[PDB]
Symmetry: D2
Subunit: 231 residues, 4 copies
């Protein structure tokens, strides 16, 4: 079958395996820093970074019908200078090889008002299509999440996320954990790949600050991934 | 370091790697059937099976302070002839090498009213120390769960469970999923091994029917496990 | 399918996963010491230790015809007080669950002059059925190796061995390496399991000193193993 | 640390993970076909293909001194229309990111008469610097192998190769196996990466036909790889 995996405890600046977009950049310290921030450490409004993984992923195969299974994990935080005023969020996702960034702020650089994406979002800001409070969601080829759940967030604290997709059931599952707070959320729903994405995709993250406010920074510290594409 | 892993898609009757206790037995079909049932398929009250994995697990090391990390997964169902009347449940756990079964019914063969166990229970029946409704819990050296969460159960449907223990934080996390229902629960809390168990343990399951009612059968279909004990 | 794996960088004295036989014992230092030795460090003639791994291994399945694949690695040395006078050797092997030791000296505790073993031997001493010089051999249900190759040995130096069995071809392959000497041997031949062993076996090592001379000590420092039994 | 792995049972034509050079191309059948061949199936002289793996590999790290370990395996054949007349061979290797092909025929597209390569060659043709007979060799930053061993080749038969590099000893080991012939060769020597390659490299294969004769075709059927870069 087809196999791939990768794992990093830290990010190496100017690493030839990640592809950076927008404001996205890797620090000396070793963080994937998605959004732009002030020397004061403050986030800057209307910011938006994306970050891809160079090798492409054969997610499903047309001749054989075969569908991959896969899993991904990451350590991430966010910094919010004013917790009463957040936005806009962070997503993990999969798109097509030549994906460039869409709309910002509430679109988390993924969708536009009027392009073949599957994603899991961690939304901080209640848009028109949003539910109340921060949440986690599954976006299948659209920004209006097909399912959501509250997101019990904590500022400046480390979140450990885990995403799994089980080809067998077409069941995607996302869980988030604040060990710092012994806190946990889970969300699950079925998604069909064979019809919402292309045989080969690329993966990564997207994150966006407030359109008209700073909102919160979005740094990613670790990344892990593996996939299996049976014949 | 120390490594171990194992994985089964099915159970082989009379397999020399699992140790059966009580009513516990493996069917031809390939199920680990924990509790006793009528030819009519019905569960029989005051039933109780346990099931262990032969090789012992070096969970932590005294000389070096080192603590393992580990993870386990399983497919399991339960059969309840009358869903208004359930009990008593199923636990996954770790105990000491020479562990034999404790009390039944509400003790899930793990504790006695007055012995060095860490477990995750899926309790169906509201005992004195229980919270309302079915739940999932973390029992550290006792039957009174240190944390719980609702358990969104479904009769006769397949549940996929995942348990992880992260030595780094001493954070144990349990999640359950009904893909059949696109349903999900998670529970997390910190637990100290070095003080609630012995350097070497054995793992397995325990399950129990109604004391005075049939309650529900408890079959396990798959098992997966892996551990890492750094130096 | 069926999976198992284990890995140790060191041996823990009195570990409940290994089963010791004969003179076999684990030192404080962390070595699996197979044969008996003088305080002077000298080997003692007519010595013989064996060492097993507790969990049993489902090597092949009768109902389904399925055959495992597997691989094993180890760091081992030998100490010879007089290199002109060696014997008798070390083997790695697989036998049936209830295997106890056979004949010593030239039988490496595996065979008797007149019991269901597959093994790879590292023979130091030219017996009647031996080829000239030290060698490596594949013994299928007998002490008369079906194939051999020279063994370019070095006293007191670390050897890294690797053994692989490819169910697909029934091809067993053994390689030995002295990184200290940038030295290497390989041997390969086909072996049928389904007819030379039982569905379930146990694995381990066997080693033996000179019958009437000290010969050489045989210590094992690390062990690694993994198996896969498809359906 | 840094981890990567990949595995293919077959090659997918026009796959976005492999980079093709020269005559190198992937067939419908699923073979990586390195050299050009006649409809009659014949190889064509002065042919030369190379093939790379897109993601780059962090082989060693300057700040931390750290060196990777790695391993690779492949199924490969060659077709020789006239076995008395062979050339020129196949190599596996690692080079720098922007590597393009060097000289052909006896240089296996790797070196030029007067560029930072480590490779393992399977040479069919006795050049000026060659030893007698086909052989296997380790080329550290040059075409004159630092070590060789006979290569017991068989035309049109499947060879299974395995390459390992153990950072701990700086010991590279290569083994080749013809299960069809129950045949085996091994070669090992120490190599310093930190001084013969760049922190980041790319890997692949190179293969070349006769300069003035057809020689032999060189197809690769499978590929496997994994690396670990500790901190
Ligand atoms: Ca929103
Ligand atoms: Ca209860
Ligand atoms: Ca002998
Ligand atoms: Ca040559
Ligand atoms: Mn949303
Ligand atoms: Mn309870
Ligand atoms: Mn012999
Ligand atoms: Mn050469």
């Amino acid at each position: 079958a087809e196999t791939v995996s990768f794992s990093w405890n830290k990010f190496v600046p100017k690493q030839p395996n990640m592809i950076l977009q927008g404001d996205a950049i890797v620090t000396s310290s070793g963080k994937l820093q998605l959004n732009k921030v002030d020397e004061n450490g403050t986030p800057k409004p209307s910011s938006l970074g994306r970050a891809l993984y160079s090798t492409p992923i054969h997610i499903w195969d047309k001749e054989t019908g075969s569908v991959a299974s896969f899993a991904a994990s990451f350590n991430f935080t966010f910094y919010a200078p004013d917790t009463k005023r957040l936005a806009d969020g962070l997503a993990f996702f999969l798109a097509p090889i030549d994906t460039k960034p869409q709309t910002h702020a509430g679109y988390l650089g993924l969708f536009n008002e009027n392009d073949q994406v599957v994603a899991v979002e961690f939304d901080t800001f209640r848009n028109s299509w949003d539910p109340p409070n921060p949440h986690i969601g599954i976006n299948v080829n659209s920004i209006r999440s097909i399912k959501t759940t509250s997101w019990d967030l904590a500022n400046n604290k480390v979140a450990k996320v885990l995403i799994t997709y089980d080809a067998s059931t077409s069941l995607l599952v996302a869980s988030l954990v604040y060990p710092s707070q012994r806190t946990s959320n889970i969300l699950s729903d079925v998604v069909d790949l064979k019809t919402s994405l292309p045989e080969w995709v690329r993966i990564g993250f997207s994150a966006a600050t407030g359109l008209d406010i700073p909102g919160e920074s979005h740094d990613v510290l670790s990344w892990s991934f593996a996939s299996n594409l049976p014949h």
